[PDB]
Specification:
Keywords (chain D): Cytoplasm, Isopeptide bond, Nucleus, Phosphoprotein, Ribonucleoprotein, Ribosomal protein, Ribosome biogenesis, RNA-binding, rRNA processing, rRNA-binding, Ubl conjugation
Distance between the termini of chain B: 12 Å
Helix content of chain B: 10-25%
Number of strands of chain E: 28
InterPro entries (chain D): Ribosomal_uS4, Ribosomal_uS4_CS, Ribosomal_uS4_euk/arc, Ribosomal_uS4_N, S4_RNA-bd, S4_RNA-bd_sf
Shape of chain B: globular
Oligomer: part of a larger assembly
Strand order of the largest sheet of chain B: 1-2
Protein name (chain D): Small ribosomal subunit protein uS4A
Number of helices of chain B: 1
GO molecular function, one term (chain D): structural constituent of ribosome
Largest interface: A-E, 28 and 29 residues
Strand content of chain B: 25-35%
Subcellular location (chain D): Cytoplasm; Nucleus, Nucleolus
Chain lengths: ~120, ~60, ~55, ~170, ~450
RNA sequence: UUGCCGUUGCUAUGGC
């Protein structure tokens, strides 16, 4: 019923943000909505993360339409401030993407989250 | 800067001495001579150099300790 | 809009800066059941402030 | 290590070629070593399975083995059961090697580059310089992999060639 | 006259001063050495008068003041020589401040009644950029990137600063002239916090490469590097003992380092809102630990990004007591700004009720050493002063001070007066943005300056 | 008491 949906609870949000921080260290994170649309178009996106508090929220409501068409899991986290912090950049980030890589060191952790997002949707 | 560190200190009045295991941290240095450790141990413990004996030194693999 | 110069070196920067803000406004319009002009205004004022800066 | 039953099977040769290429191993001896370790682990797991559930032996040694495999990282936290211990493969063990971890973390551009880095004493696990590629990385040690303080890539002074060419340039 | 005589003279005069002030002499003398025993011996929290505190905010020109370090001379009972560097500097209280504008500033804070007074400064800039681009060549005298942390030496002879330039520059206190530059020798070795071992020349410098480094300022040399953190070591605290404590931010770990034994103790909150909710039959899960200060050699307090202030004991790995959402919850975002929808009710649905709300972060946290009082800070707009219970098993809010408005980057406290009668001054750096980065949304009324609050105790 | 711009007194706080 709300536009931002599904919204991850507290416990899940901690796990999502953790993966984002690890991905950023390994150069597997694309930060910002414009990059996220580029990843979905190229179909290299394991899943998309979005800020439910983005002001206004409609500015990133184009991504789900991309996500649902291409069959890519997605989730909303309550804080854009927190999302930007975990991403490692010095400004708020409203949308971020985890690039696909089967040679990644954090593969198992990513797939662990990916299943949970899928259950939520 | 070399750091000299004593652990497992045992006072042995039977032989009239103090025994311990000494750690020498010497980053960016090959190793610290027995004599120079005698000097620094003497200064730290307030005893004459002649009274300070050290032996059984082995550097850890890769250096630095 | 680069074939008819719809959005239009310093000149180039305002075009690209304006180009993003157009995409921002478009998204609000498209996914909003009853779009308003409140966010279009503050967006335009933001582009203006950039304009004097350059 | 122990020689496999029929080394000359074509499938076996192609398997060894794939594993070597993917993880840049030096000889089939490394593959045999890992296979022998895995064989022991799986045989123990089987013998435990043959026992009745709630057996004190099954319980004690079984949770012990599961804990150890988790600690080495081969078995994920969500699969703490001996049945999954039977499902392990050689690739899981090879991945935990220090060469592969160095490659994956982004410190090297290739598995062979990782091998030459490690053998050149440029890679440190915590405080210790590890120049042994077949070193096995746990979980806790996974995050502590870095360039050694003495390494020129780790911030120390440049190697022999760098300062030599610098001197030749200055003169 | 032999120095034994000189100590005898100062000692005899000192006793007469104690006698003039007044059993009692014996009790007072024991109190002088209470520092040696690492136990809280300053139980004066109840005596404080939060309400009557005299607050004042001094605006500073520079952008985003990031840290403040206060130097307070102490008469050494062992030799009866004041810690002041020079005779001119006798009994003079100094404060050193740094900002993101690459400027270090010192103040005089001797007069509690009067505002801080600028004395000298040194500013960095592009001139100091290293040409070589190598880490071991990063030995330019001034800074060229953001400064983040500062500490003023207990002897009053040096102040050392570090920031994102991956350097450690030590400055002479008197003239603010550079005397030595210590590179961190790392590609990502940015300095995130500094601490002087109390009444000593040893440094503990926390770095962004997930390591803690130690230095001996007097010899201008680095001693050891400490390893074990899985994430950036944002803050570090120290007391007279070599037991420095640290927090690992996203790792959600507070590690106490026993330098003497070369061992470390791991403390993890492990607070899970399933059980917290179940026992209740809004709670936020902790994200990271930023601020830490050592109340006692055997206790310390940490502040996380979920607004939880925790009390820890060396004996117990899990927290002994937690205060959740200490500083409150952020105001909800404007419904006129959540969406561009014309209809109000549709905009309200975007807020998703109370799900979006979040708690304030604990940006700063300081505890007066070996005391039962500590101060917390955030951009809620009010400093909060707490008191730990006598048994050191709990704490309660002693009061608040509403003067500060903006992000509280760092807090300091300084005292003056006789032993029985002391006045406490609370100095805190306030900036318009969080020290590490610009994430926080701009706070209404925030201004860059040094907040001050003088408090006296009566009863 | 501020880099810049105001307000308020003979001191205090509003914006960038």
């Amino acid at each position: 019923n709300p536009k931002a949906f599904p919204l991850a609870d507290a416990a899940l949000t901690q796990q999502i943000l953790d993966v984002v921080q690890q991905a950023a260290n390994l150069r597997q994170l694309k930060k910002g909505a414009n990059e996220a649309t580029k990843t979905l178009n190229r179909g290299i996106s394991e899943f998309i993360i979005m800020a439910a508090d983005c002001e206004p929220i409609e500015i990133l409501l184009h991504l789900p339409l991309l996500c649902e068409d291409k069959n890519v899991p997605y989730v909303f986290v309550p804080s854009r401030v927190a999302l930007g912090r975990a991403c490692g950049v010095s400004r708020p980030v409203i949308a971020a993407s985890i690039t696909t890589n089967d040679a990644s060191a954090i593969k198992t952790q990513i797939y662990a989250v990916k299943d949970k997002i899928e259950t939520l949707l | 800067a070399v750091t000299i560190r004593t652990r497992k200190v045992i006072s042995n009045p039977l032989l009239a001495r103090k025994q311990f295991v000494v750690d020498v941290l010497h980053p960016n240095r090959a190793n610290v001579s027995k004599d120079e450790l005698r000097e620094k141990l003497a200064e730290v413990y307030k005893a004459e150099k002649d009274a300070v004996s050290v032996f059984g030194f082995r550097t850890q693999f890769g250096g630095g300790k | 809009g680069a074939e008819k110069a719809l959005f239009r070196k310093n000149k180039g920067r305002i075009s690209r800066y304006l180009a993003n803000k157009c995409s921002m406004a478009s998204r609000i319009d498209n996914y909003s059941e009853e779009p308003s002009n409140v966010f279009g205004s503050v967006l335009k004022k933001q582009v203006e402030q950039r304009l004097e800066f350059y | 290590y122990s020689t496999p039953k029929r080394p000359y099977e074509s499938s076996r040769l192609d398997a060894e070629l794939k594993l070597a290429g993917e993880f840049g191993l030096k000889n089939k001896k490394e593959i045999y070593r890992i296979s022998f370790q895995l064989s022991k682990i799986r045989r123990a797991a089987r013998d435990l399975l043959t026992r009745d559930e709630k057996d004190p032996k099954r319980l004690f040694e079984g949770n012990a083995l599961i804990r150890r495999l988790v600690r080495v990282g081969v078995l994920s936290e969500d699969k703490k059961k001996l049945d999954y211990v039977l499902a392990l493969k050689v690739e899981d063990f090879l991945e935990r090697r220090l060469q592969t971890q160095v490659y994956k973390l982004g410190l090297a551009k290739s598995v062979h580059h990782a091998r030459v880095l490690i053998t050149q004493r440029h890679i440190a696990v915590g405080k210790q310089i590890v120049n042994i590629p077949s070193f096995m990385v746990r979980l806790d040690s996974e995050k502590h992999i870095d360039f050694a303080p003495t390494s020129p890539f780790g911030g120390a002074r440049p190697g022999r060639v760098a300062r030599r060419n610098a001197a030749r340039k200055a003169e | 006259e032999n120095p034994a005589d000189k100590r005898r003279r100062l000692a005899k005069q000192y006793l007469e001063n104690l006698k003039s002030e007044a059993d009692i002499i014996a009790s007072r003398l024991k109190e002088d050495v209470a520092e040696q025993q690492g136990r809280v011996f300053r139980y004066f929290g109840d005596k404080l008068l939060i309400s009557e505190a005299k607050q004042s905010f001094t605006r500073v020109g520079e952008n985003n003041l990031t840290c403040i370090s206060c130097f307070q001379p102490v008469l050494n009972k062992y030799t009866f020589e004041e810690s002041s560097n020079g005779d001119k500097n006798k009994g003079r209280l100094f404060a050193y401040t740094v900002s993101k504008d690459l400027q270090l500033t010192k103040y005089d804070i001797t007069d509690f009644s009067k505002r801080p007074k600028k004395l000298k400064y040194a500013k960095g800039g592009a001139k100091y950029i290293p040409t070589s681009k190598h880490e071991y060549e990063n030995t330019t005298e001034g800074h060229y990137d953001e400064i983040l942390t500062v500490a003023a030496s207990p002897d009053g002879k040096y102040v050392v600063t570090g920031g994102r330039d991956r350097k450690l520059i030590v400055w002479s206190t008197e003239s603010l002239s550079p005397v030595k530059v210590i590179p961190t020798k790392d590609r990502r070795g940015e300095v995130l916090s500094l601490a002087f071992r109390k009444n000593s020349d040893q440094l503990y410098a926390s770095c962004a490469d997930f390591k803690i480094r130690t230095y001996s300022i007097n010899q201008f040399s680095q001693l050891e590097i400490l390893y074990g953190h899985h994430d950036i070591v944002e803050d570090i605290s120290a007391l007279a003992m070599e037991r420095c404590v640290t927090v690992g931010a996203r790792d959600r770990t507070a590690m106490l380092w026993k330098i003497p034994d070369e061992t470390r103790l791991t403390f993890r909150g492990g607070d899970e809102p399933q059980k917290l909710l179940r026992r209740w039959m809004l709670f936020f899960c902790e994200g990271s630990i930023d601020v830490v200060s050592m109340v006692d050699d055997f206790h310390f307090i940490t502040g996380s990004d979920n607004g939880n202030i925790c009390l820890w004991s060396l004996a117990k790995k899990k927290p002994i007591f937690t205060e959740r959402i200490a500083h409150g919850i952020l105001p909800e975002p404007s419904f006129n700004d959540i969406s561009g929808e014309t209809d109000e009710e549709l905009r309200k649905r975007q807020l998703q009720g109370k799900k979006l709300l979040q708690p304030f972060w604990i940006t700063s946290l300081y505890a007066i050493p070996y005391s039962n009082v500590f101060i917390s800070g955030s951009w809620s707009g009010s400093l909060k002063v707490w008191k730990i219970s006598d048994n050191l098993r709990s704490f309660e809010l002693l009061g608040e001070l509403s003067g500060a408005k903006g992000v509280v980057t760092k807090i300091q406290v300084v005292e003056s007066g006789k032993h029985g009668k002391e006045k406490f001054r609370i100095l805190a750096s306030i900036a318009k943005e969080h020290r590490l980065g610009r994430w926080i949304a701009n706070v209404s009324g925030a201004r860059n300056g040094i907040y001050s609050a003088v408090i006296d105790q009566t009863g």
